[PDB]
Amino acid sequence: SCLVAGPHQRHIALSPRYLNRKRTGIREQLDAELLRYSESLLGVPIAYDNIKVVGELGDIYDDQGHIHLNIEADFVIFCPEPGQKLMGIVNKVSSSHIGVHGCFNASIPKPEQLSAEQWQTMEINMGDELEFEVFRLDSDAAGVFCIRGKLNITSLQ
């Protein structure tokens, strides 16, 4: 189960426009800008910030107008990681690849299946000629985290 919770401290610089309305502004752009976008600091899709609080006070720094402060936030995260056998939606069968929950996109480059199974253009048949186009074995351990629309490269061996 991808269930994850990570308590992390972030640094956020709030504009003086969001003084009376901080909780509104602490999220408007400074936290809602990487909404479930791959994180490299901890390997995290940021689902949504459940709570964003400040321990005490804010430090306006000399000429700068912004108010800098610290945000202790729990990121509820879905972590499919190496060591897991996940599922995948089978929609389109290709030689290049085989493209969960309608939002997690997964990939399967060519030489990642059992080579005992030979393919036909319209649909592919596996060992015992049993057609499987459904949530089934998908074990991803090589993961892209760079491209805007990231990937989830799944395996079955």
Partner 1 sequence: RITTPYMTKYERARVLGTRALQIAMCAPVMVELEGETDPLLIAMKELKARKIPIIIRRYLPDGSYEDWGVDELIIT
Partner 2 sequence: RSNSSPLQQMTFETSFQFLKQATMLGSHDELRSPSACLVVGKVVRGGTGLFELKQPL
Partner 3 sequence: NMPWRRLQGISFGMYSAEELKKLSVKSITNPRYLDSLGNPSANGLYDLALGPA
Q: Hey, what's the torsion of the CAs at 121, 100, 154, 44, to 10 degrees? A: 150
**DSSP state string for 34-71:** STT---TTTT-----EEEEE-SS--EE-TT--SEEEEE
User: Given the structure tokens 């991808």, which residue do they identify?
Assistant: 2
Q: Which is nearer to partner 3, 64 or 94 (CB)?
A: 64
Q: Counting contacts by CB under 8 A, is residue 109 touching partner 1?
A: no
Site for partner 1 in 64-93 (CB under 8 A): 65
CA count, 13 A, side-chain hemisphere, 11: 4
Query: CB under 5 to 8 A by kind: which of partner 1, partner 2, partner 3, none does 56 bind?
Result: partner 2
* Amino acid found at 55: G
Structure tokens at 101: 């929950």
Q: Counting contacts by CB under 8 A, is residue 58 touching partner 2?
A: yes
Single out the segment in contact with partner 1 by CB under 8 A; choices: 14-22, 28-36, 74-82, 146-154: 14-22
Q: Counting contacts by CB under 8 A, is residue 17 touching partner 3?
A: no
> Which residues are registered as beta bridge partners of 119?
124
Single out the segment in contact with partner 2 by CB under 8 A; choices: 32-40, 50-58, 92-100, 148-156: 50-58
Interface with partner 2 by CB under 8 A: which residues? 19, 22, 54, 56-60, 62, 67, 69
The binding site for partner 3 (CB under 8 A) comprises: 11, 13, 61, 64, 66, 68
